[PDB]
Design a protein around this ligand. Structure first.
Ligand code: MG
Ligand code: MG
Ligand code: MG
Ligand code: MG
Lengths: 438, 437
């Protein structure tokens, strides 16, 4: 643990907190929340705050199911921005059924579940190193955003100098003084694009910071007449934002992917784990890349791995010893971190649990080699549409078992609508073409 | 030394630095960096910070070169302008490969290489006194540049009175506080143009202040609703910007160009030095004058002259420990380290081969015909980036001045830039052809 009951109450009073924000997360990953005045902290800490859990069921909730909010003291956070009447603090709560049992449809529980599934295989933890990127569009006079990029910067360039905007440099200062452990940050390839790399930590805790991040970001951004969007492909013909996930299995407190003797120094646990994802990649994409836009960014356009290449689905970074990780470059910021990891973790366990090996490391042939040329090898292609990604998700087995009932049932259903809406829609593009030629 | 690890650590605390900018420079000159919280100063100081090396190669990136960042303590600086939760610092670094070796495709490190050559020849230092001219423009409500000049002044005029703007003034008052050693400054021959000269400095130290300079200018300019633009030929009709460079080699501390008892007091090492720049000027212009726009400002004839209109090489009056060669063709758009590199090479290639410098320039060159350019030293510079690249490609020493790598990519990045401009259909074209033809 970290914080204690009394420790909190002491920190709330001594710091003047009058607005406790009990927050969670729904199937889509959007920051859900139920606010209660400081005077309710009591009822809350005892885990007696009831809310309509139907919420968590995306935009397809029928009845009004009741569930409890189990806050976790180790996540007690006090936001920098003050209110006029007092400070505001937060707690991340696991949803629970009226019978004191973890709601099987909760995205954060589903992870502590697979995480328990990890330990059964004799593993200490699962650390995540996320590399989330976003754009910053200017706000108009009214308040609505516009395709007005906040700067014309380029990859790794030195965006607006310290004397001015530089919303990046600020989100960081904040995230740091707030409690984050960021490695570094820089300007991304696309103008107005930025990346902020966090250190590592336990899966469930990383997914926790991904959420807090997206939240902190948007907040500060607003306070700069800007709009922050973790949307995969904002503008056509411009670089898309992604969110590489640095993975690493620890056992008995030591990296289970390292081998200071085996070639590439990759333990047998690594390769195995590696092959695992590959096997289920083309399938868990519908999770790691939810939205319709996601695939407009998949034009790792190829399913392959190696020490380094143009658009590889996977990639093992230089770093050795502890920092012996596996990068999954397909996931985007739109994905739900608690599902991105749930699905990702299993995809790697099923390889370890079933001992699997993948083809030799992709040399220097992926982009140039044609499709059927990549078909004559262990180089398949990720699905190109959310429609197609979902089909490969409903048929996969470990995936379905990775989200269980609720999550699967509702996700597939929801996401189906998303696609039906988008396909039964008549876009401007259509008219541009067919309206006259036909 | 100037800043022991311990010292910096003492500084960052006492001054309250909550943001370390680990900045460097790519092949295209663009100033870049990797920002880390002060909560990583150690991880960085230990040269353990990684970043996508390919950022150097530029817009022609393909893969990701997991390279490292090695900060030069002595380049420690604390930007006057403060964030909020604290101040912001920085370190100009050197790019290294996962195997502790200096990335060969990095400029800052390249200049250092060419410095070893200058040393494996007895020479101790190779100084530089840049004269970076620039233009200042207004911004619109949206906060976008425009062709409106902050002032309509002229040569050495008394630019914006001390009351109000005087963007140039503050620019310098800031650089002074920062640590620069400014000689002077005036107002160039064009409305909104300016020039700031720096006390000569070490090949590297100077190139570094040139970069730091463009930044401080660029910044404060915004801090004044203006827009700084080192673009060489902002617009047709008005004067163009340029970054003269006062080259001067030293041996055993003292100047190796001076010579009390001798013709003009310019030692053989100097005469030969001039010589090497004459036969290479046309072959390094593409580097010293990168942008396709550079040549729109070069409308010019290779030849040295103690005094004249716009000669490629010039020899300032002052001598003694100030004796020096000035290459007036270079402009602010040029990657400083490469400009020096290419020049030090063209220069050293004359010192180690003892070259005979052709007679200087006398009367005006504007009245020099083309057939006589074949006879007399009137070999004009390249007219377009295209012709300048071919030339660069030709000369061997110039290629050995950036190494396979830095050379391989420069040619590419620059060739595509050209083809882009070439395959383009400009307004001018339509204006003169759509009606006639
Ligand atoms: Mg990236
Ligand atoms: Mg990475
Ligand atoms: Mg001048
Ligand atoms: Mg001069």
């Amino acid at each position: 643990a970290k914080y204690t009951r009394e420790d909190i109450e002491k920190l709330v009073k001594e710091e003047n907190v009058k607005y406790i924000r009990l927050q969670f997360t729904d199937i889509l990953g959007t920051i859900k929340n139920v606010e209660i005045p400081v005077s309710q902290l009591g009822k809350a800490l005892d885990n007696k705050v009831m809310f309509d859990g139907s919420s968590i069921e995306g935009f397809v909730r029928i009845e009004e199911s009741d569930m409890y909010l189990y806050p976790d003291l180790n996540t007690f956070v006090i936001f920098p921005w003050t209110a006029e009447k007092g400070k505001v603090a937060r707690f991340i709560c696991d949803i629970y059924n009226p019978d004191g049992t973890p709601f099987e449809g909760d995205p954060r529980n589903n992870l502590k579940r697979i995480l328990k599934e990890m330990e059964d295989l004799g593993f200490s933890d699962f650390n995540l190193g996320p590399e989330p990127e976003f754009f910053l569009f200017k706000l108009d006079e009214k308040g609505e955003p516009t395709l007005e990029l906040n700067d014309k910067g380029g990859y790794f360039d030195l965006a607006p100098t310290d004397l001015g905007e530089n919303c990046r440099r600020d989100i960081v200062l904040e995230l740091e003084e707030m409690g984050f452990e960021i490695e570094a940050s820089h300007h991304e390839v696309a103008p107005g694009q930025h990346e902020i790399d966090f250190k590592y930590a336990g899966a469930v805790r990383s997914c926790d910071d991904i959420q807090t991040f997206k939240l902190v970001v948007k907040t500060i951004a607003r306070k700069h007449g800007l709009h922050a969007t973790f949307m995969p492909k904002p503008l056509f013909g411009v670089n898309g934002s992604g969110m590489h996930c640095n993975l690493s299995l620890f056992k008995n407190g030591v990296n289970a992917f390292f081998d200071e003797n085996a070639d590439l120094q990759l333990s047998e646990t690594a390769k195995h784990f590696i092959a695992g994802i590959v096997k289920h990649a083309t399938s868990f994409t519908a999770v790691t890349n939810p939205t319709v836009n996601s695939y407009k960014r998949l034009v790792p356009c190829y399913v392959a791995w190696s020490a380094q290449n143009r658009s590889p689905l996977i990639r093992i970074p230089a770093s050795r010893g502890i920092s012996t990780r596996v990068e999954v470059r397909s996931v985007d910021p739109a994905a739900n971190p608690y599902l991105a990891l749930s699905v990702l973790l299993a995809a790697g366990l099923d390889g370890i649990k079933n001992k699997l090996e993948a083809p030799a490391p992709i040399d220097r042939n992926i982009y140039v080699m044609s499709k059927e040329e990549r078909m004559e090898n262990g180089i398949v292609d990720l699905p190109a549409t959310l429609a197609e990604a979902l089909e490969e998700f409903k048929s996969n087995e470990v995936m379905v078992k990775a989200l269980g009932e609720h999550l699967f049932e509702h996700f597939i259903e929801a996401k189906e609508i998303e696609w039906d809406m988008f396909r039964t829609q008549v876009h401007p593009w259509e008219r541009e073409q067919y309206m006259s030629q036909y």
